[PDB]
Symmetry: C4
Subunit: 333 residues, 4 copies
């Protein structure tokens, strides 16, 4: 019986080999951006409203044309067989059963078509390939398999310097492969190529500058994820949570604005919402639950987050996620 997301991190550290726990936990460089994601959420306080009608509190949203049960999706995390033998299929099944979107990775350890067959209306995360037309082929595979959005990762012209991985000499076990199969830096040209090749909404993940948010709308994106890649890319990149309010104001409803990095409770989901997010992504905690207890672990985590989101919303006087977006906040110490 886990009563917070931190109970699951403790359980995952017990089970996983050290080097795999480090691949999961780590960030780039000195891990300043990884720590700052948590700092930034901890400094945000909500100003709750009282005495509102809570007869029919709902945590549901509509996004990219589908109803979701919570304002949350599972973030793209590569190589989930590292954490549990059922890898992506375990997490995808749990997500489906919880009504939350699951992002299938370009570097998934089970093929995208197998994970899409689980059901649950899935999203697909794209890394740009050096071999471009292979890029558009992954996108078409994803669309043919029933994925509902293309989450184009735009913060990885190459992978950051993960010092834990270097120190550990980490490499994929022989038994974990990139099951969908040397990548190139993406540009605004790449975005347009993808937009022209699909009818699915294109979501740019890894935007932090206001002007890049605005350009994303101008480029025809359906959404952005305001994100420093969990502190795994530029060490010293600002947390997404610190940019979110400014970005929300700048796009002024022109696309969905998601945030990630450090979300560890339903109260953090409420903070993100109050700052203007349409939804959040959650990465590491979903992998902790997978490592600890497989599919059932992920189910328990999603049930716990659902309960915490509903609790937080109602304590704050919000019968709907839209009401939560109208909450005010105060930055503390």
């Amino acid at each position: 019986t886990y009563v917070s997301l931190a109970d699951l991190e403790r359980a995952a550290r017990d089970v996983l080999p050290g080097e795999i726990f480090d691949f999961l936990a780590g960030g780039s460089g000195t891990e300043a951006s990884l720590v700052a994601n948590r700092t930034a959420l901890e400094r945000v306080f909500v100003i709750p409203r009282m005495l509102r009608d809570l007869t029919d509190v709902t945590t549901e949203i509509d996004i990219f044309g589908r109803r979701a049960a919570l304002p949350m999706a599972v973030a793209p995390v590569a190589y989930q067989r590292l954490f549990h033998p059922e890898g992506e299929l375990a997490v995808a099944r749990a997500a489906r059963d919880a009504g939350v979107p699951y992002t299938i990775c370009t570097l998934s350890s089970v093929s995208l078509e197998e994970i899409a067959a689980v059901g649950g209306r899935p999203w697909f995360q794209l890394f740009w390939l050096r071999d471009e037309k292979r890029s558009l082929d992954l996108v078409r595979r994803a669309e043919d398999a029933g994925c509902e959005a293309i989450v184009f990762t735009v913060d990885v012209p190459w992978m950051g310097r993960r010092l834990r991985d270097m120190r550990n000499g980490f490499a994929l076990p022989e038994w974990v492969t990139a099951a969908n199969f040397e990548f190139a830096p993406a540009t605004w040209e790449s975005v347009e190529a993808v937009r022209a090749h699909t009818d699915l909404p294109v979501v740019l993940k890894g935007i932090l500058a206001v002007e890049d948010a605005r350009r994303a709308v101008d480029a025809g994106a359906g959404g952005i994820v305001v994100s420093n890649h969990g502190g795994r890319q530029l060490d010293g990149a600002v947390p997404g949570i610190e940019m979110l309010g400014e970005i929300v104001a700048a796009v002024s409803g022109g696309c969905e604005v998601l945030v990630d990095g450090g979300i560890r409770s339903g109260g953090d989901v409420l903070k993100a919402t109050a700052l203007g997010a349409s939804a959040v992504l959650v990465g590491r905690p979903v992998m902790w639950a997978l490592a600890a207890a497989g599919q059932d672990g992920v189910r328990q985590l999603l049930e716990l987050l659902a309960e915490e989101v509903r609790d937080a919303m109602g304590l704050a006087g919000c019968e709907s996620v839209g009401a939560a977006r109208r909450l005010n906040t105060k930055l503390g110490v």
Copy 2:
């Protein structure tokens, strides 16, 4: 001989069973709001005035039609027999003898009429019942018994997630019951129902948004308590002390504005006053004193707070609480 309120916490931790100390000490979630209540007071500094007439320093106030000896009341705390066998009666007697108002709880472990019979002009705290007309019956019982104000708790549509209690598996001992006897969320409609059913002042406890303070005045409240429920309700709710000055300015004398959360000395009372509070509530420390030494413990705590309030006021150049409200403050680190 206790020389600070912290001496009493040490004494209560020694005597109480762990799970009961945790019920008392704990907050919701990660306990961020519980910690922030203390942080927020610690960052406030007073700018004292010198060379004023202190011939007749008085700590008295008039509130809800009665003189009180200090700008303080005992906060509503449920189930006080958990802490000492004499429970509410011990605290109520001490409060009476100190000249400070005592708030009788809807979840008192001794009936409201027994505690009111102690004397001391008492207040009554209301939780809204799912069974509404039972709500108005508790209010009428309280008024018939001589309570002087109705403290309507508006921040508990349901109880928060108290992880210490969950982890401990805490439940009331068989020997502690809700002696006044399934509740429902309160709304502004509920407030009006209460206001129409009583001539007593209605005080809304748990207001943090400025606009809710203003609506409270418009709704005919006689007072509000600016409060995050001691960090026991929404985890991430702003401390009341951080909202107080803004709220005081917004109501511009339309009702009494009390604050609670983390008050642990007469100097903290002075801070609250300087920020504009009419009075404060004190919760946990009163229970520490009750656990440590029963009625006499609570008497000692009230005498110590009285001394500290008078000391602080005079060192700050204030012959009256109104003068203290005109002090300026500076936020530090």
Copy 3:
């Protein structure tokens, strides 16, 4: 060989009885204001100037009609025989030989006339007596003995709550007495009585509010000391260093503006100067040096501070204290 003021605190803690070290070190209440005095100085950074003429760097000032060797005086500290058998006479002799003013206390453990006979042009600190005309008699004694200024302490309507002293049960040894011999709160009337009874400059020690600084000038004060009494009076009083710049601007040269609280190096003297102080007082460190090594200890401390002040000034491009007052500062973390 002491190379910083902190070397002397270590030496004094070794020698003094615990309860006497606590009388010296302690503050009121939770000691928040005592800690904040240090915090506040630590957050101030100087913006030094380069490439100025330093041929004739001088640390001298003119104050209350006399040249002083440094922009520093020894603060009033009661009962110096607590620290060393030669008490006040040891400190006064050292101060004389260093060219810095020494403040003789109303609660000195050697009579004011004996300490004045040491020489060095001394100041006299006044506590207002309940018996008023005795007040004016102490002032006249001081003036007859050759004191050069009356430092009227205005922040002690009564003594603060020193919890270390309470816990230790501290009291003066039989062998330490108030050698100049039930006091009353001072008012603006008291200030005028003193001003009318002496031709010496009257300096009000313990001013923190801007308006009290202004009133001090209007009342004919020759100086003020911006001070929270070393955190020994109101617990939660703002540090003087945090008020200084505002106060300096408000009096706009109408009286000398001194500061105290936490000065522990020549660099801290430079900070105080840059914020606009005419001079600083130093309390605890002078007593550490007295406890450690008597007169010679105090001499060593004054020589070390002189060296640090001259070093700091010159590294900052300041050939005179007036130049140091024109330095700019930046508040950091």
Copy 4:
């Protein structure tokens, strides 16, 4: 295999005698400015840009008429034979081979002409001599030997109070001497004397006030180094990184603006650039690498910094250093 600059500090502490490690690591006074250099960088976050062309990322700059491989030079550090027997020659050879400028010190432990003979287009750091025409003789020696800029240190009218050195009784071993051979404070007159005696660019190192930056341009400087001398001069001097943006704006392209103090990664170089620096100096880390492994150690450090700078730039969307200067930043906690 070192994967961060901190790996080299650990290696140098193992090898060097304590008193020599302290000479290198220490600062003046309480070491507040030394610590603040790190604090200040840690509070700066970069707002990276995405989706830019990174086909030809280059870390090169043009400065003082020469191409440099990175926006970095080796800071002047006296007496490098303290750290390794090959001293300056080892560091100069490494710097040459990495394409980065090396600053030859007036207090070098190998003569300036020997170090210049290594090649690599070197700079020369000047301390003003009490014997002035000797000053201009060092400058002419440097120019005759092929140095490309005169880095005039303007923050050392005399050496600061290094308490570690005092406590250790540190002095140069007999086997380390000032191989180029009682100095005097420099003034603006001295700057002009140097400017009139050389055609090389004159760079003033140790400027922190905005007005001194402006005067430097007016005086004909080719550059300034915004610097508190690694916290070794005035204890309480503001970090250069906290002044940099203001200074850059004030000179508005009138000279090159370099910064130093606490640069410990390529990400810190990116921060400095984003705040407007033309280039940085790096001191202590270069000496750590020299102590640990001599010339090859310094080569490894420069290769690691090159990799980190290129990584940071590209993750931030910058194909050139000029693009990096146009990045925005956000100050965090």
